[PDB]
Amino acid sequence: NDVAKVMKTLDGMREGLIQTAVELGSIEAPTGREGAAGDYVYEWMARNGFGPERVGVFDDRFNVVGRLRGTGGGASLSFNSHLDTIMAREDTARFADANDRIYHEAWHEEGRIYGYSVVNCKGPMACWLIAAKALKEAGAALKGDVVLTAVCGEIDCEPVDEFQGHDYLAEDIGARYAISHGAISDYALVAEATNFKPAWVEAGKVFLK
Amino acid sequence: VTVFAGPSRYTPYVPRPVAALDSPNAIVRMAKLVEALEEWADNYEKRYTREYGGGTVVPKVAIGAIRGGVPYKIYRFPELCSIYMDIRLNPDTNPLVVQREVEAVVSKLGLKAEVKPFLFRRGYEAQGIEPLQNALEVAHREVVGRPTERPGSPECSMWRDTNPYNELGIPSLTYGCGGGAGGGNTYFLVDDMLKAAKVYAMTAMDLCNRTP
Numbered sequence: 520n521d522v523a524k525v526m527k528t529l530d531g532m533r534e535g536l537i538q539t540a541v542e543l544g545s546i547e548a549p550t551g552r553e554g555a556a557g558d559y560v561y562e563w564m565a566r567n568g569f570g571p572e573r574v575g576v577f578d579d580r581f582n583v584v585g586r587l588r589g590t591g592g593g594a595s596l597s598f599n600s601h602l603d604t605i606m607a608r609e610d611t612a613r614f615a616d617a618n619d620r621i622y623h624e625a626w627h628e629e630g631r632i633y634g635y636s637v638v639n640c641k642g643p644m645a646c647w648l649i650a651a652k653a654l655k656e657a658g659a660a661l662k663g664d665v666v667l668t669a670v671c672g673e674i675d676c677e678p679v680d681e682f683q684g685h686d687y688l689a690e691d692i693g694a695r696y697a698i699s700h701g702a703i704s705d706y707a708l709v710a711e712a713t714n715f716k717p718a719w720v721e722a723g724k725v726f727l728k
Numbered sequence: 729v730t731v732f733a734g735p736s737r738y739t740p741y742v743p744r745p746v747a748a749l750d751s752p753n754a755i756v757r758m759a760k761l762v763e764a765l766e767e768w769a770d771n772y773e774k775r776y777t778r779e780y781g782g783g784t785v786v787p788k789v790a791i792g793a794i795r796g797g798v799p800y801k802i803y804r805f806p807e808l809c810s811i812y813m814d815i816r817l818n819p820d821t822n823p824l825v826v827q828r829e830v831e832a833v834v835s836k837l838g839l840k841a842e843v844k845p846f847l848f849r850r851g852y853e854a855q856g857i858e859p860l861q862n863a864l865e866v867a868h869r870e871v872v873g874r875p876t877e878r879p880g881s882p883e884c885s886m887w888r889d890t891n892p893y894n895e896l897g898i899p900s901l902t903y904g905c906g907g908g909a910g911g912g913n914t915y916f917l918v919d920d921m922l923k924a925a926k927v928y929a930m931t932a933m934d935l936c937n938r939t940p
């Protein structure tokens with residue numbers, strides 16, 4: 520089997536997985552200021568030879584798209600997670616304790632990794648960044664491409680009234696922008712937290728004033 | 729008045745159904761606090777009405793602003809929500825007394841809240857006003873024709889700059905033409921403005937010729 524080789528490769532990458540998640544979760548990146556986090560993921564993909572591109576509407580809010588190229592003749596698979604996080608230190612209007620710790624930082628304690636920034640979503644993103652690294656470095660045989668798509672603006676912030684433009688946009692400049700501008704593939708796995716339970720329906724939304 | 733609730737939840741996880749006062753959404757709880765506060769206000773103005781020589785003070789209460797949280801991030805309801813109250817005082821009411829009354833309204837609902845004052849100014853009745861009162865009275869009867877009447881309560885129960893003067897020992901009253909803008913009147917008669925200017929001048933000619 521050529522699979523087992525990768526599994527044992529992944530058993531040895533426990534530490535890089537932890538480090539990547541913690542370094543990534545530690546980065547200040549609430550929706551609207553995901554640039555710095557994007558930069559880390561770009562430079563991470565570059566070092567590991569995934570040939571990344573910045574695909575975005577603004578030079579400081581962008582998606583990062585790189586690939587693990589195939590031998591030829593297979594189906595493409597995307598892995599997708601988002602760079603933005605929920606809490607900004609700004610938000611004293613939504614949280615009783617805007618400056619807690621679980622809201623903004625990320626650390627390795629016991630056998631856990633703590634931080635909202637990790638659960639959502641730096642996180643599942645670390646998981647497949649490592650998975651991609653294992654496949655490449657284990658020299659696994661793949662006919663089809665693996666597309667690595669790290670996006671901005673997934674979280675449901677939206678502009679309204681006098682709050683317009685760059686600082687308040689989210690989903691319009693996130694994944695759908697990336698996909699519409701190259702990040703296409705045959706199939707896509709979005710890596711977010713379920714409890715190891717697959718879901719392939721999702722809801723829409725209407726916002727009313 | 730900031731009402732606390734929580735824990736924050738992403739909309740697909742919000743617990744329903746839940747009793748209003750138990751809602752994790754601070755906006756929901758506040759809505760319940762608002763009707764309790766409006767009835768408290770209905771009784772406040774009557775309980776603290778007080779008659780002075782300079783007028784009857786009818787101290788009213790209004791909720792002037794609300795907010796929580798921010799409009800451009802609504803996918804999680806707020807753990808807190810604030811209200812901003814204008815509560816008028818008669819000259820003889822201590823602000824802390826009023827604060828405890830409001831703390832009590834909240835307490836009756838079982839809500840956790842912060843009642844924090846961010847403005848306090850004292851109201852005053854003038855002491856030793858008779859010389860100005862009289863000088864004006866004389867002028868008023870000459871120009872307007874009858875004795876002066878007792879002022880309307882809203883014009884006694886507001887903030888006007890008679891307070892700083894009185895606070896600092898300069899006996900002071902207020903007097904002009906027309907209905908108050910808080911009313912809201914939107915115009916003056918030119919004839920009445922002329923009358924006032926005459927009264928002002930006459931008042932000055934009397935009063936400024938007394939030896940202090």
Ligand SMILES: O=C(O)c1cc([N+](=O)[O-])ccc1O
Nearest residue numbers: 886887888907908909910911
């Ligand atoms: O003198 C007034 O009528 C008056 C009204 C307002 N207001 O209606 O907001 C404010 C200050 C005033 O002096």
Ligand SMILES: [Mn+2]
Nearest residue numbers: 639640673711
């Ligand atoms: Mn997410």
